[PDB]
Amino acid sequence: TTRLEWAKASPDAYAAMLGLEKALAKAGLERPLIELVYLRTSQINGCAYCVNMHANDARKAGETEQRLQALCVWQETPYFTPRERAALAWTEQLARLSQGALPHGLLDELREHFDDKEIAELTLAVSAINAWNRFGVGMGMQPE
Amino acid sequence: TTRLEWAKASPDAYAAMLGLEKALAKAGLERPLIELVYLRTSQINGCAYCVNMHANDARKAGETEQRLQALCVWQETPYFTPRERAALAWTEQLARLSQGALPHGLLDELREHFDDKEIAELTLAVSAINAWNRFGVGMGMQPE
Amino acid sequence: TTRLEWAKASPDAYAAMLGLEKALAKAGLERPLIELVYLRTSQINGCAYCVNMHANDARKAGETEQRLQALCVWQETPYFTPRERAALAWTEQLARLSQGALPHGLLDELREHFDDKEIAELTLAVSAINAWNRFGVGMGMQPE
Amino acid sequence: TTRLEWAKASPDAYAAMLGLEKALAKAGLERPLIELVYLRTSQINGCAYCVNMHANDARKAGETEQRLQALCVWQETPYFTPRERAALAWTEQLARLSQGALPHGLLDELREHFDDKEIAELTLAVSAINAWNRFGVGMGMQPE
Amino acid sequence: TTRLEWAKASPDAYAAMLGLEKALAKAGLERPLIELVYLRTSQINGCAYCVNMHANDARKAGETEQRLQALCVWQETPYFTPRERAALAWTEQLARLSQGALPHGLLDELREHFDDKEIAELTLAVSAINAWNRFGVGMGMQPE
Amino acid sequence: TTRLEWAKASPDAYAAMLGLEKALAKAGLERPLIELVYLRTSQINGCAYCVNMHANDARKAGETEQRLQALCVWQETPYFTPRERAALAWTEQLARLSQGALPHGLLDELREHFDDKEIAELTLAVSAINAWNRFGVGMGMQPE
């Protein structure tokens, strides 16, 4: 289930990572949207531990099986709102940041759906799950 | 130089991100290695703001022009130690986490050069710069 | 939900595609494995119509939410049998056939888990869903 | 020339695959265009058996060496008609379905050159060769 | 057929490029192998002008339709000698130099088939066609 | 520092490659721009020998550390002129020629900044460094 118990090795790193979650917990950004961002990022990054945790946490936040099964192919479905689709486009592009430039009008399109405080919180969410995925995959973590 | 002043929009997000840096500042992991990790990740992710900042910070940590110019092609040079090369392999693979699975023996190879506490700190470093790059590129940040 | 009613346009094409399903229905290859192959291929190919249909059909074949949510990251989980993992490796490699050569020992590894008749049936399953996905995405099909 | 005699292992699979060809034989879609679709798909998928067979079959359908040698780079040549170029764009995009979304206006552009029955037949052709390529490469088939 | 007459614009550039060909003409490396290297590189780089020219020049050097049609999928055919396959592996890897590191043992494997003078000549051939392709595609050149 | 002394093995190849440099030396195209083209191409192709040489040669041509460290991420910086950015776009696209088609309007955009003789010289520069990189990486060359 893990190859390295990293939170025990560096309690400071674990505390710092929990600080990201504390900030997000205080954010106005709605929790079901954060869970989608987390689940989709974890899918893209191939972090099975995080996929399992956030599919489970998304259900805790009220999500349906229809949405959870469609998330990996969200672009070609009618299940996600204009606001969610904006956030998921952001999520996908930032997950794949090593692969090339972000399109010019992307932030501008996000601004049609989110105020700037929400954008900061959304980007924190994206950054945090990207960070958790790196610990998850790196330390060789497996679900159940 | 920026399209969105995100630290002003969400002070909580900014404080949380600074908490990653506070943890790293307290880590035993040597600062010049952290700067290489930061600079290389920022290059891969195309974050010009972070490239500029960390090339400058690497010089503050004593780095030579030879190493700074060779970092983007580090694999085929003799300038980086076995320990640094292990960390840079980790850095590159985790930067590109969306692109496929991590090789099986990668953590095992890292363990030949780093103790588990160092590995946790190194992974925190990788995670933190990946997070900063996402704010940098997302918010449309440009250097000087 | 569709941009082109292709089965009405070419009844012969539709009948031919149903012939693939008739053959598979008669195959010894177990149905839950076929559903995994179908669902995973549809995810890779981004066919939302087929993802929806086969996640639903997989439940009809007895599948758990744990397996359905973990399928997209199956490699790093303990939920799939040696035989299923062999089939899913085959599935992923053949889904991505345009991207490069198949590894040398792949068929040999499949032979450790499947007899040659099963391999033929498995490859028919892979081929059939790849075909359905092409109609699904091409004709602009969306679920629910 | 083959690692697994799949048609002998599963006669039902072979009969089902021949049913795709029977439908195409009855289609109004012109045979030389089908051969181009088959040859180009087989090139993209790296199926040497199918490349050999369809380059040979294309000659049987009247094709010139000029067209056969230019097909792999068809975009930057004057040898292919507006209708063929539409079909080849479709062919390339659907060959590479695992690599990302199909452009929005692609079906609309195809409709400028083909009626809906032809589009269904063309998509059957694309699907069928994609299926044959998977058997060809999977079963380790080599030409001559 | 061309968007820019580059040889007229810079006669010095044209003379320099012809100097590569003069050196190759004097090389011991056999001409049919050079033509394969040229044709395969031109295919990979999508230079239709060069594909046309070198498929035609390969016929002038004695090549068969069987080999010319199989070249794009050479790996899975029996038509190319151990020596040619070594050269084509070199050709493919160096065509795709922007895509990642060259495998460690590649030069060593080439040395099993070629002496060092031949390797230098082969690499000149690869370099020269890569250069011609860049003029061809850049200047918008089309065959016939 | 090298696995094969290629200039000694084939003096003709070396003389031919020097002929590219002789032509460029005579070109009106300004030397600092050529050095940027060389350095950026060498970075993309992962040729550590050439990166080292041209970062050093760029300093000889007057370049600043600010520009040299920002070159790998030039798109998102203000340090490069409209003319340089046009040349670097050309450089990147032609470095990555094996990866797909060149955008339609690219030569047209280059023509807004360069006359046709300059474009020929620029393309010679791109071609020459692509050639040198292939010798550098192929022959296993390492800096210092």
Side-chain angles (χ1 to χ4, degrees), chain F residues 57-82:
Chain F
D57 285 352
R59 296 190 183 90
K60 292 207 300 171
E63 274 312 336
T64 59
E65 300 308 330
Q66 175 66 264
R67 277 164 51 94
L68 292 175
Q69 73 192 25
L71 179 63
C72 63
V73 291
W74 62 269
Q75 294 95 332
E76 283 311 312
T77 73
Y79 309 129
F80 303 93
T81 74

PDB file of all heavy atoms in Angstrom, chain F residues 57-82:
ATOM      1  N   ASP F  57      29.756  30.691 -26.899  1.00  0.00           N
ATOM      2  CA  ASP F  57      29.846  31.533 -28.112  1.00  0.00           C
ATOM      3  C   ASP F  57      28.853  32.708 -28.115  1.00  0.00           C
ATOM      4  O   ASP F  57      29.151  33.784 -28.661  1.00  0.00           O
ATOM      5  CB  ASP F  57      29.606  30.711 -29.374  1.00  0.00           C
ATOM      6  CG  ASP F  57      30.794  29.835 -29.759  1.00  0.00           C
ATOM      7  OD1 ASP F  57      31.877  29.965 -29.151  1.00  0.00           O
ATOM      8  OD2 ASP F  57      30.621  29.022 -30.690  1.00  0.00           O
ATOM      9  N   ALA F  58      27.682  32.502 -27.520  1.00  0.00           N
ATOM     10  CA  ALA F  58      26.707  33.586 -27.371  1.00  0.00           C
ATOM     11  C   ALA F  58      27.253  34.696 -26.480  1.00  0.00           C
ATOM     12  O   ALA F  58      27.143  35.879 -26.830  1.00  0.00           O
ATOM     13  CB  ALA F  58      25.370  33.063 -26.866  1.00  0.00           C
ATOM     14  N   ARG F  59      27.877  34.334 -25.354  1.00  0.00           N
ATOM     15  CA  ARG F  59      28.600  35.314 -24.533  1.00  0.00           C
ATOM     16  C   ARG F  59      29.692  36.054 -25.344  1.00  0.00           C
ATOM     17  O   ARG F  59      29.872  37.272 -25.201  1.00  0.00           O
ATOM     18  CB  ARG F  59      29.237  34.665 -23.293  1.00  0.00           C
ATOM     19  CG  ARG F  59      28.250  34.080 -22.306  1.00  0.00           C
ATOM     20  CD  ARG F  59      28.896  33.660 -20.956  1.00  0.00           C
ATOM     21  NE  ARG F  59      27.873  33.040 -20.103  1.00  0.00           N
ATOM     22  CZ  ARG F  59      27.579  31.738 -20.081  1.00  0.00           C
ATOM     23  NH1 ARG F  59      28.271  30.874 -20.819  1.00  0.00           N
ATOM     24  NH2 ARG F  59      26.590  31.299 -19.308  1.00  0.00           N
ATOM     25  N   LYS F  60      30.400  35.322 -26.204  1.00  0.00           N
ATOM     26  CA  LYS F  60      31.418  35.940 -27.068  1.00  0.00           C
ATOM     27  C   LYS F  60      30.786  36.956 -28.020  1.00  0.00           C
ATOM     28  O   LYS F  60      31.426  37.943 -28.399  1.00  0.00           O
ATOM     29  CB  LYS F  60      32.184  34.890 -27.882  1.00  0.00           C
ATOM     30  CG  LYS F  60      33.093  33.972 -27.066  1.00  0.00           C
ATOM     31  CD  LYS F  60      34.265  33.448 -27.906  1.00  0.00           C
ATOM     32  CE  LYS F  60      33.799  32.647 -29.134  1.00  0.00           C
ATOM     33  NZ  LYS F  60      34.951  32.329 -30.037  1.00  0.00           N
ATOM     34  N   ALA F  61      29.544  36.694 -28.414  1.00  0.00           N
ATOM     35  CA  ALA F  61      28.781  37.606 -29.260  1.00  0.00           C
ATOM     36  C   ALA F  61      28.043  38.709 -28.457  1.00  0.00           C
ATOM     37  O   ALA F  61      27.186  39.395 -29.021  1.00  0.00           O
ATOM     38  CB  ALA F  61      27.800  36.817 -30.153  1.00  0.00           C
ATOM     39  N   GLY F  62      28.380  38.867 -27.167  1.00  0.00           N
ATOM     40  CA  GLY F  62      27.775  39.892 -26.278  1.00  0.00           C
ATOM     41  C   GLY F  62      26.549  39.553 -25.399  1.00  0.00           C
ATOM     42  O   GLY F  62      26.053  40.418 -24.657  1.00  0.00           O
ATOM     43  N   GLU F  63      26.065  38.308 -25.435  1.00  0.00           N
ATOM     44  CA  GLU F  63      24.801  37.972 -24.736  1.00  0.00           C
ATOM     45  C   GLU F  63      24.842  38.080 -23.222  1.00  0.00           C
ATOM     46  O   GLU F  63      25.896  37.858 -22.612  1.00  0.00           O
ATOM     47  CB  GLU F  63      24.288  36.583 -25.105  1.00  0.00           C
ATOM     48  CG  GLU F  63      23.452  36.540 -26.324  1.00  0.00           C
ATOM     49  CD  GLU F  63      22.349  37.607 -26.394  1.00  0.00           C
ATOM     50  OE1 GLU F  63      21.891  38.132 -25.343  1.00  0.00           O
ATOM     51  OE2 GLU F  63      21.957  37.907 -27.536  1.00  0.00           O
ATOM     52  N   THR F  64      23.696  38.415 -22.626  1.00  0.00           N
ATOM     53  CA  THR F  64      23.566  38.562 -21.164  1.00  0.00           C
ATOM     54  C   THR F  64      23.101  37.275 -20.494  1.00  0.00           C
ATOM     55  O   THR F  64      22.484  36.429 -21.135  1.00  0.00           O
ATOM     56  CB  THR F  64      22.533  39.640 -20.782  1.00  0.00           C
ATOM     57  OG1 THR F  64      21.267  39.284 -21.333  1.00  0.00           O
ATOM     58  CG2 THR F  64      22.949  41.048 -21.275  1.00  0.00           C
ATOM     59  N   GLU F  65      23.363  37.139 -19.189  1.00  0.00           N
ATOM     60  CA  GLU F  65      22.886  35.937 -18.487  1.00  0.00           C
ATOM     61  C   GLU F  65      21.359  35.862 -18.480  1.00  0.00           C
ATOM     62  O   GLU F  65      20.790  34.787 -18.557  1.00  0.00           O
ATOM     63  CB  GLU F  65      23.449  35.828 -17.065  1.00  0.00           C
ATOM     64  CG  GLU F  65      24.971  35.747 -16.996  1.00  0.00           C
ATOM     65  CD  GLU F  65      25.599  34.658 -17.881  1.00  0.00           C
ATOM     66  OE1 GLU F  65      24.978  33.590 -18.149  1.00  0.00           O
ATOM     67  OE2 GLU F  65      26.762  34.871 -18.296  1.00  0.00           O
ATOM     68  N   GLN F  66      20.716  37.024 -18.406  1.00  0.00           N
ATOM     69  CA  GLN F  66      19.266  37.126 -18.445  1.00  0.00           C
ATOM     70  C   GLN F  66      18.673  36.472 -19.685  1.00  0.00           C
ATOM     71  O   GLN F  66      17.750  35.665 -19.608  1.00  0.00           O
ATOM     72  CB  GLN F  66      18.863  38.610 -18.374  1.00  0.00           C
ATOM     73  CG  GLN F  66      17.387  38.835 -18.531  1.00  0.00           C
ATOM     74  CD  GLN F  66      16.635  38.257 -17.372  1.00  0.00           C
ATOM     75  OE1 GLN F  66      16.131  37.128 -17.447  1.00  0.00           O
ATOM     76  NE2 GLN F  66      16.578  38.998 -16.279  1.00  0.00           N
ATOM     77  N   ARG F  67      19.217  36.815 -20.845  1.00  0.00           N
ATOM     78  CA  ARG F  67      18.763  36.185 -22.070  1.00  0.00           C
ATOM     79  C   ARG F  67      19.134  34.713 -22.165  1.00  0.00           C
ATOM     80  O   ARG F  67      18.307  33.885 -22.557  1.00  0.00           O
ATOM     81  CB  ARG F  67      19.225  36.989 -23.272  1.00  0.00           C
ATOM     82  CG  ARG F  67      18.239  38.136 -23.500  1.00  0.00           C
ATOM     83  CD  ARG F  67      18.743  39.212 -24.376  1.00  0.00           C
ATOM     84  NE  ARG F  67      19.287  38.780 -25.658  1.00  0.00           N
ATOM     85  CZ  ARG F  67      18.615  38.717 -26.800  1.00  0.00           C
ATOM     86  NH1 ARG F  67      17.310  39.003 -26.850  1.00  0.00           N
ATOM     87  NH2 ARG F  67      19.262  38.381 -27.907  1.00  0.00           N
ATOM     88  N   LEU F  68      20.346  34.363 -21.758  1.00  0.00           N
ATOM     89  CA  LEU F  68      20.757  32.957 -21.893  1.00  0.00           C
ATOM     90  C   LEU F  68      19.915  32.038 -21.010  1.00  0.00           C
ATOM     91  O   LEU F  68      19.613  30.916 -21.414  1.00  0.00           O
ATOM     92  CB  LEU F  68      22.256  32.768 -21.571  1.00  0.00           C
ATOM     93  CG  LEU F  68      23.187  33.415 -22.610  1.00  0.00           C
ATOM     94  CD1 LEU F  68      24.635  33.301 -22.165  1.00  0.00           C
ATOM     95  CD2 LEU F  68      23.008  32.797 -23.971  1.00  0.00           C
ATOM     96  N   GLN F  69      19.563  32.495 -19.805  1.00  0.00           N
ATOM     97  CA  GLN F  69      18.756  31.645 -18.893  1.00  0.00           C
ATOM     98  C   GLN F  69      17.256  31.581 -19.272  1.00  0.00           C
ATOM     99  O   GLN F  69      16.557  30.615 -18.906  1.00  0.00           O
ATOM    100  CB  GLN F  69      18.925  32.061 -17.436  1.00  0.00           C
ATOM    101  CG  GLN F  69      18.230  33.381 -17.068  1.00  0.00           C
ATOM    102  CD  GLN F  69      18.650  33.924 -15.716  1.00  0.00           C
ATOM    103  OE1 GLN F  69      19.740  33.634 -15.216  1.00  0.00           O
ATOM    104  NE2 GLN F  69      17.794  34.741 -15.122  1.00  0.00           N
ATOM    105  N   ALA F  70      16.797  32.608 -19.986  1.00  0.00           N
ATOM    106  CA  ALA F  70      15.381  32.743 -20.399  1.00  0.00           C
ATOM    107  C   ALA F  70      15.094  32.126 -21.756  1.00  0.00           C
ATOM    108  O   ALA F  70      13.926  31.946 -22.140  1.00  0.00           O
ATOM    109  CB  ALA F  70      14.981  34.221 -20.409  1.00  0.00           C
ATOM    110  N   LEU F  71      16.146  31.786 -22.497  1.00  0.00           N
ATOM    111  CA  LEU F  71      15.942  31.295 -23.859  1.00  0.00           C
ATOM    112  C   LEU F  71      15.071  30.044 -23.920  1.00  0.00           C
ATOM    113  O   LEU F  71      14.260  29.913 -24.829  1.00  0.00           O
ATOM    114  CB  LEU F  71      17.289  31.076 -24.565  1.00  0.00           C
ATOM    115  CG  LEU F  71      17.229  30.538 -25.992  1.00  0.00           C
ATOM    116  CD1 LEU F  71      16.515  31.540 -26.941  1.00  0.00           C
ATOM    117  CD2 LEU F  71      18.672  30.224 -26.448  1.00  0.00           C
ATOM    118  N   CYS F  72      15.227  29.126 -22.963  1.00  0.00           N
ATOM    119  CA  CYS F  72      14.487  27.856 -23.008  1.00  0.00           C
ATOM    120  C   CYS F  72      12.984  28.057 -22.758  1.00  0.00           C
ATOM    121  O   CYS F  72      12.187  27.150 -23.009  1.00  0.00           O
ATOM    122  CB  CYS F  72      15.041  26.844 -21.997  1.00  0.00           C
ATOM    123  SG  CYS F  72      14.909  27.351 -20.268  1.00  0.00           S
ATOM    124  N   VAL F  73      12.621  29.239 -22.282  1.00  0.00           N
ATOM    125  CA  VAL F  73      11.232  29.594 -21.981  1.00  0.00           C
ATOM    126  C   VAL F  73      10.880  30.946 -22.641  1.00  0.00           C
ATOM    127  O   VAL F  73      10.067  31.709 -22.107  1.00  0.00           O
ATOM    128  CB  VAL F  73      10.945  29.644 -20.443  1.00  0.00           C
ATOM    129  CG1 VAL F  73      10.993  28.256 -19.821  1.00  0.00           C
ATOM    130  CG2 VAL F  73      11.877  30.660 -19.691  1.00  0.00           C
ATOM    131  N   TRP F  74      11.502  31.221 -23.792  1.00  0.00           N
ATOM    132  CA  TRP F  74      11.498  32.561 -24.420  1.00  0.00           C
ATOM    133  C   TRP F  74      10.078  33.110 -24.675  1.00  0.00           C
ATOM    134  O   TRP F  74       9.845  34.324 -24.579  1.00  0.00           O
ATOM    135  CB  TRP F  74      12.292  32.529 -25.740  1.00  0.00           C
ATOM    136  CG  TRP F  74      11.728  31.618 -26.783  1.00  0.00           C
ATOM    137  CD1 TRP F  74      12.043  30.303 -26.985  1.00  0.00           C
ATOM    138  CD2 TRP F  74      10.751  31.955 -27.786  1.00  0.00           C
ATOM    139  NE1 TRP F  74      11.319  29.794 -28.043  1.00  0.00           N
ATOM    140  CE2 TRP F  74      10.527  30.789 -28.559  1.00  0.00           C
ATOM    141  CE3 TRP F  74      10.059  33.124 -28.108  1.00  0.00           C
ATOM    142  CZ2 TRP F  74       9.620  30.756 -29.637  1.00  0.00           C
ATOM    143  CZ3 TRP F  74       9.151  33.099 -29.183  1.00  0.00           C
ATOM    144  CH2 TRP F  74       8.947  31.924 -29.931  1.00  0.00           C
ATOM    145  N   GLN F  75       9.144  32.210 -24.985  1.00  0.00           N
ATOM    146  CA  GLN F  75       7.760  32.603 -25.342  1.00  0.00           C
ATOM    147  C   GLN F  75       7.079  33.495 -24.330  1.00  0.00           C
ATOM    148  O   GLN F  75       6.354  34.432 -24.704  1.00  0.00           O
ATOM    149  CB  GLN F  75       6.897  31.364 -25.609  1.00  0.00           C
ATOM    150  CG  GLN F  75       7.332  30.574 -26.826  1.00  0.00           C
ATOM    151  CD  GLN F  75       8.273  29.393 -26.511  1.00  0.00           C
ATOM    152  OE1 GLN F  75       9.034  29.412 -25.519  1.00  0.00           O
ATOM    153  NE2 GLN F  75       8.231  28.364 -27.367  1.00  0.00           N
ATOM    154  N   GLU F  76       7.314  33.221 -23.045  1.00  0.00           N
ATOM    155  CA  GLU F  76       6.651  33.950 -21.991  1.00  0.00           C
ATOM    156  C   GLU F  76       7.540  34.994 -21.304  1.00  0.00           C
ATOM    157  O   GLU F  76       7.384  35.290 -20.123  1.00  0.00           O
ATOM    158  CB  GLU F  76       6.017  32.971 -20.999  1.00  0.00           C
ATOM    159  CG  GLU F  76       4.682  32.335 -21.544  1.00  0.00           C
ATOM    160  CD  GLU F  76       3.692  33.380 -22.099  1.00  0.00           C
ATOM    161  OE1 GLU F  76       3.426  34.408 -21.428  1.00  0.00           O
ATOM    162  OE2 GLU F  76       3.170  33.178 -23.220  1.00  0.00           O
ATOM    163  N   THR F  77       8.463  35.561 -22.070  1.00  0.00           N
ATOM    164  CA  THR F  77       9.325  36.625 -21.564  1.00  0.00           C
ATOM    165  C   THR F  77       9.267  37.849 -22.480  1.00  0.00           C
ATOM    166  O   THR F  77       8.892  37.722 -23.646  1.00  0.00           O
ATOM    167  CB  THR F  77      10.794  36.182 -21.527  1.00  0.00           C
ATOM    168  OG1 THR F  77      11.298  36.146 -22.854  1.00  0.00           O
ATOM    169  CG2 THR F  77      10.969  34.791 -20.879  1.00  0.00           C
ATOM    170  N   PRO F  78       9.678  39.017 -21.970  1.00  0.00           N
ATOM    171  CA  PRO F  78       9.768  40.208 -22.811  1.00  0.00           C
ATOM    172  C   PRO F  78      11.156  40.494 -23.400  1.00  0.00           C
ATOM    173  O   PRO F  78      11.372  41.581 -23.952  1.00  0.00           O
ATOM    174  CB  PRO F  78       9.395  41.316 -21.832  1.00  0.00           C
ATOM    175  CG  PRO F  78      10.031  40.857 -20.536  1.00  0.00           C
ATOM    176  CD  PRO F  78       9.965  39.334 -20.551  1.00  0.00           C
ATOM    177  N   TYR F  79      12.080  39.538 -23.291  1.00  0.00           N
ATOM    178  CA  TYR F  79      13.493  39.803 -23.606  1.00  0.00           C
ATOM    179  C   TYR F  79      13.883  39.679 -25.070  1.00  0.00           C
ATOM    180  O   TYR F  79      14.982  40.082 -25.437  1.00  0.00           O
ATOM    181  CB  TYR F  79      14.404  38.862 -22.806  1.00  0.00           C
ATOM    182  CG  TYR F  79      14.103  38.854 -21.355  1.00  0.00           C
ATOM    183  CD1 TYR F  79      13.911  37.654 -20.678  1.00  0.00           C
ATOM    184  CD2 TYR F  79      14.019  40.048 -20.636  1.00  0.00           C
ATOM    185  CE1 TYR F  79      13.634  37.639 -19.330  1.00  0.00           C
ATOM    186  CE2 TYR F  79      13.732  40.042 -19.274  1.00  0.00           C
ATOM    187  CZ  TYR F  79      13.537  38.828 -18.639  1.00  0.00           C
ATOM    188  OH  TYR F  79      13.260  38.815 -17.307  1.00  0.00           O
ATOM    189  N   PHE F  80      13.006  39.104 -25.884  1.00  0.00           N
ATOM    190  CA  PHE F  80      13.339  38.793 -27.269  1.00  0.00           C
ATOM    191  C   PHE F  80      12.504  39.660 -28.208  1.00  0.00           C
ATOM    192  O   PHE F  80      11.300  39.874 -27.972  1.00  0.00           O
ATOM    193  CB  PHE F  80      13.185  37.276 -27.518  1.00  0.00           C
ATOM    194  CG  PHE F  80      14.042  36.438 -26.582  1.00  0.00           C
ATOM    195  CD1 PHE F  80      13.534  35.944 -25.370  1.00  0.00           C
ATOM    196  CD2 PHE F  80      15.385  36.189 -26.898  1.00  0.00           C
ATOM    197  CE1 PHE F  80      14.342  35.198 -24.490  1.00  0.00           C
ATOM    198  CE2 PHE F  80      16.208  35.464 -26.010  1.00  0.00           C
ATOM    199  CZ  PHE F  80      15.688  34.964 -24.815  1.00  0.00           C
ATOM    200  N   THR F  81      13.144  40.196 -29.241  1.00  0.00           N
ATOM    201  CA  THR F  81      12.477  41.124 -30.172  1.00  0.00           C
ATOM    202  C   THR F  81      11.448  40.384 -31.041  1.00  0.00           C
ATOM    203  O   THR F  81      11.501  39.171 -31.128  1.00  0.00           O
ATOM    204  CB  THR F  81      13.483  41.829 -31.115  1.00  0.00           C
ATOM    205  OG1 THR F  81      13.952  40.903 -32.110  1.00  0.00           O
ATOM    206  CG2 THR F  81      14.667  42.400 -30.339  1.00  0.00           C
ATOM    207  N   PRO F  82      10.491  41.115 -31.656  1.00  0.00           N
ATOM    208  CA  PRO F  82       9.561  40.533 -32.644  1.00  0.00           C
ATOM    209  C   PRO F  82      10.285  39.688 -33.682  1.00  0.00           C
ATOM    210  O   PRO F  82       9.838  38.583 -34.002  1.00  0.00           O
ATOM    211  CB  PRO F  82       8.918  41.767 -33.286  1.00  0.00           C
ATOM    212  CG  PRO F  82       8.883  42.755 -32.178  1.00  0.00           C
ATOM    213  CD  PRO F  82      10.169  42.525 -31.385  1.00  0.00           C
TER     214      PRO F  82
END
